[PDB]
Amino acid sequence: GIDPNRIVALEWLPVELLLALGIVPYGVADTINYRLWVSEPPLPDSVIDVGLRTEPNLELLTEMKPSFMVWSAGYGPSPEMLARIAPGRGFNFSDGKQPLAMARKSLTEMADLLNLQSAAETHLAQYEDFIRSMKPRFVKRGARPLLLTTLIDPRHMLVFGPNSLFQEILDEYGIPNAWQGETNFWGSTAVSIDRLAAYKDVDVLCFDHDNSKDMDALMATPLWQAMPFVRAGRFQRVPAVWFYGATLSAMHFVRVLDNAIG
């Protein structure tokens, strides 16, 4: 990916890989929603918005002449088509089981392409040290399971399972994941609100994403007010954290997790 000042990121996973290595993306797809869902690593104003991750402005990309383009494997435009625009590389979010293990491989992969091998090691070290250092902030709690969720719309809640980005973190902190049901490759699944009522005694965190009107609707239903974990006083709304990112999203999760139940 030769010129490090002309890299265009078409998905938020590799944006995060670039930022962790100190690169300032030349262009990034959907900067508007990035602010609502990822929020962290804010993107400098210089960054050029190249459209939706699913329908990027191909005209713009062509005019921009990126030195390299990065995206997420299995997501968005055809990689065969993108490769026709400029040199590029697709990155894997997971192997279907451990997203963070993949995140560490992707970071190394990206760094080798950009010859930032040292920057990647320093970061990976900062990452592993941070996760370990926070461990004692969750020694107090027991084995009460934790349910990680986010509201898609009043009728569907996403729940993050065993193969989600957050699992390795929960595992390291000795926090059982309340969700042991099915999940997609990305580590989540959408469930109707009633399915959440099955969780009598658990702590629940719900990541916000500028959806107060939606949350308001949900919390106004008799079902939500009847929710056992709600009445138990175990429900908490927390700030947005990208669930399909890498090491930066993982550390962002720990800070949010800390503030919520640390």
UniProtKB/Swiss-Prot annotation:
It comes from the Bacteria. InterPro entries: ABC_transptr_periplasmic_BD, Bact_iron-sidero_bind. Residues 6-262 form the Fe/B12 periplasmic-binding domain. One of its GO terms (biological process) is iron ion import across plasma membrane. It holds the Pfam family Peripla_BP_2. Keywords: Ion transport, Iron, Iron transport, Periplasm, Signal, Transport. Induction: Induced 1.3-fold by hydroxyurea. Exported by the Tat system. The position of the signal peptide cleavage has been experimentally proven. Can also be exported by the Sec system. GO terms for cellular component: ATP-binding cassette (ABC) transporter complex, substrate-binding subunit-containing; outer membrane-bounded periplasmic space. Its main location: periplasm. The record marks 55, 57, 59, 156, 192, 195 as: Interaction with FhuB. Fe(III)-coprogen binds at residues 37, 53, 72, 75, 93, 186, 242-244. It is found in: Periplasm. The complex is composed of two ATP-binding proteins (FhuC), a transmembrane protein (FhuB) and a solute-binding protein (FhuD). FhuD interacts with FhuB. Substrate-loaded FhuD binds FhuB more strongly than FhuD alone. Belongs to the bacterial solute-binding protein 8 family. Part of the ABC transporter complex FhuCDB involved in iron(3+)-hydroxamate import. Binds the iron(3+)-hydroxamate complex and transfers it to the membrane-bound permease. Required for the transport of all iron(3+)-hydroxamate siderophores such as ferrichrome, gallichrome, desferrioxamine, coprogen, aerobactin, shizokinen, rhodotorulic acid and the antibiotic albomycin. This is Iron(3+)-hydroxamate-binding protein FhuD. It comes from Escherichia coli (strain K12).
